[PDB]
Design a binder for this molecule. Structure first.
Ligand SMILES: CCCCCCSC[C@H](NC(=O)CC[C@H]([NH3+])C(=O)O)C(=O)NCC(=O)O
Ligand SMILES: CCCCCCSC[C@H](NC(=O)CC[C@H]([NH3+])C(=O)O)C(=O)NCC(=O)O
Lengths: 208, 208
């Protein structure tokens, strides 16, 4: 079945977990502590020496976006055709770019860089609002009329940004309604409210 | 048909161009100068305010990896099945991670960081050598027995790293043979030797 191997944080596993939960999939969580990681064996066995590590049967995967694409490809959450598939990729790559900036702020210079980051935030969120406005008035999904792995990844990006900069979505009606709508999906809503999600820190250094 | 809109550098368009050329595809190059970019209109119209911008008919794409995946999907360079597709993604995501480090060095701190970067290089290249050793002895491609978009992306990564750190591949026999083999492919070889590739700088700040 499915097994996600990761540190006890939401981090880069938050989106894929929301996906599995919303899709009614069952999975096993193999939690790796900082202590165990510092031992060295697991790290050495990891392709790029990092987590998350994912297992689907005897298929062992690394790279969070590879896991998302795999699940999207196998579960039918990758658009209706090649054109939509490309659009889904364009969204996910954009989500990834901002996530990298977020991760850098959180772990590299939270104190000194937070103000500048928050000031620049609107311009970084704007593209996703525009994408929504061009897809059935932002009433459905980020691409097409069916959910894709990029939706879960974007949802997480928006959720963690609300915590970082409360009210950042206020100027973006489509993104706000989008977060509420997706968060209201029955299985996702239950997951987001569960201790499994709630009692896990967003990041590993206690910053958010 | 195909049109790539980018600055006059190889940068993030090198791999996709090698792909198009090796695949015998025709494309148009719309070169954007720093002057024209500084004008602002094109930038404002770009989804994430950046280039490359790609056009496949009326399908307008952004994000270099989205372009690579699109071309890999439409041209049959994405593995033979879902399992291989996931492996192709794992490789490309790894290539992307190192490319980000490379881009940071080149544009952020070449002088002060080059030594540390080059020292860390072997450990960053090792994963691709290992992948190669696990696939038919590294005699064919990075994933499976047919070329994929990840091959072209990895090839470029290796090529630019050879310029940055001459001899870095000497410690990785499979990777060295791989670069020579792929570079020897008729259409690619002609492309790499052409002024269209040769007379373009690798990066935009004159560093390499
Ligand atoms: C400790 C609690 C906080 C953990 C932070 C999240 S894990 C960070 C890091 N992993 C990554 O950055 C994964 C990046 C990879 N590109 C992906 O997308 O999965 C890691 O394994 N780092 C370990 C290492 O490289 O040694
Ligand atoms: C000037 C000659 C050198 C050009 C260097 C490469 S272009 C750099 C930058 N674009 C990107 O970094 C693209 C990143 C994007 N994630 C992708 O993968 O395509 C850009 O458009 N920057 C312009 C901007 O953001 O204003």
């Amino acid at each position: 079945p499915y097994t996600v191997v990761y540190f006890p944080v939401r981090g880069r596993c938050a989106a894929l977990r929301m996906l599995l939960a919303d899709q009614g999939q069952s999975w096993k969580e193999e939690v790796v502590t900082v202590e165990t990681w510092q031992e060295g064996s697991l790290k050495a066995s990891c392709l790029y020496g990092q987590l998350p590590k994912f297992q689907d049967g005897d298929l062992t995967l690394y790279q969070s976006n590879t896991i998302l694409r795999h699940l999207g490809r196998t579960l039918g959450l990758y658009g209706k055709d090649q054109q939509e598939a490309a659009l889904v990729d364009m969204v996910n790559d954009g989500v990834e770019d901002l996530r990298c900036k977020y991760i850098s702020l959180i772990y590299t210079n939270y104190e000194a860089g937070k103000d500048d980051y928050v000031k620049a935030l609107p311009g970084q969120l704007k593209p996703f609002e525009t994408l929504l406005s061009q897809n059935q008035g932002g009433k459905t999904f980020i691409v097409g009329d069916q959910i894709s792995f990029a939706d879960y990844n974007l949802l997480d990006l928006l959720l963690i940004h609300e915590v970082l900069a409360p009210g950042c979505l206020d100027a973006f009606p489509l993104l706000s309604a989008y977060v509420g709508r997706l968060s209201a999906r029955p299985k996702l809503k239950a997951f987001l409210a569960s201790p499994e999600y709630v009692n896990l820190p967003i990041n590993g250094n206690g910053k958010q």
